[PDB]
Design a protein around this ligand. Structure first.
Ligand SMILES: [Mg+2]
Ligand code: NA
Ligand SMILES: [Zn+2]
Ligand SMILES: [Zn+2]
Ligand SMILES: [Zn+2]
Ligand SMILES: [Zn+2]
Lengths: 162, 162
DNA sequence: TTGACTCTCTTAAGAGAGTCA
DNA sequence: TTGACTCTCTTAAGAGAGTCA
């Protein structure tokens, strides 16, 4: 269907539009007790969002372009990756926010990986705290830490060994 | 059921039945290049599972007892925690497998924590690799590692900064 | 061709409840 | 009373597709 040039044109129009989103400076934990700064390009909270953009869920959006009278639509964060393989190890590739900020559409804050890899970044100690992700995290995951476990392993009798 | 005595009786009956499940030894990564051994008490693959147990999904079971002439039923892994708060910080408490082995019902392999804490153990480096969980992991999470990211952050133009 | 809404679905860690015998 | 099945739901990281003007 769409040629390489046409896909590049979609990516370029998406970048043009997203680059005009409000740029918000966020101070973030990097791990190892260090703090860094990320600059997120945030889609607006309500319509209008930007040329080509529309909200399909509370924190879900799509990008739409009509080419040769055919409507094409993509998940709003998938556009930077339209020239990449869409699966790996038999798993669908997903847009994964390195900044953990759903509204952000900065392509420098996104990677393209399995949903498991994507989720796992929530708990990563971060680039200065021991991140082993080959595509390195930009920050410590928001859920990293000791947790809030209510009750640990226990037995009343003696039927079990660890 | 309602009374503490009745709850303790439920926990004791559950422990006695699960204590008769086959004990399967699993050698597991601990992190730091070290290996450990866990003894999982595994519910059978097919009926009969044990007194009070029935399968409600491919890897879901429930425990049921008749008390006060009424049937009381619980998720099969929730029984050790019947005297614990059922929520934390406004999040539902869940039975969480420290051994990452769904069929296992060894209460020494279970904790009671939010679904986020539960999920996050999948990526933990483990008790000899840097686990910071206050209720410590028994093994390195099965999904720990560098990942298989297909594409990293990138832009075609010059509109974005990290 | 475009905007602003609408709907349902996927995954993998977890749940509750009803139908029969 | 107990067993063995059936169904749908929750969450938070992610998706595709329809309607109307
Ligand atoms: Mg778990
Ligand atoms: Na993510
Ligand atoms: Zn961002
Ligand atoms: Zn990382
Ligand atoms: Zn186990
Ligand atoms: Zn841990």
């Amino acid at each position: 269907a769409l040629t390489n040039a046409q896909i590049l044109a979609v990516i370029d129009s998406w970048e043009e539009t997203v680059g005009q989103f409000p740029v918000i400076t966020h101070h973030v934990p990097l791990g190892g007790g260090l703090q860094g700064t990320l600059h997120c390009y945030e889609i607006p909270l309500a319509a209008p969002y930007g040329v080509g953009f529309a909200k399909n869920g509370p924190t879900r959006w799509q990008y739409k372009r009509t080419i040769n009278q055919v409507v094409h639509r993509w998940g709003s964060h998938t556009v930077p990756f339209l020239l990449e393989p869409d699966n790996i190890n038999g798993k669908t590739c997903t847009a994964s926010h390195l900044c953990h900020n759903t509204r952000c559409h900065n392509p420098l804050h996104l990677c393209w990986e399995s949903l498991d890899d994507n989720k796992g970044r929530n708990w990563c100690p971060g680039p200065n705290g021991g991140c082993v992700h080959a595509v390195v995290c930009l920050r410590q995951g928001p859920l990293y830490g000791p947790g809030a476990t209510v009750a640990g392993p226990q037995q009343r009798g003696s039927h079990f060994v660890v």
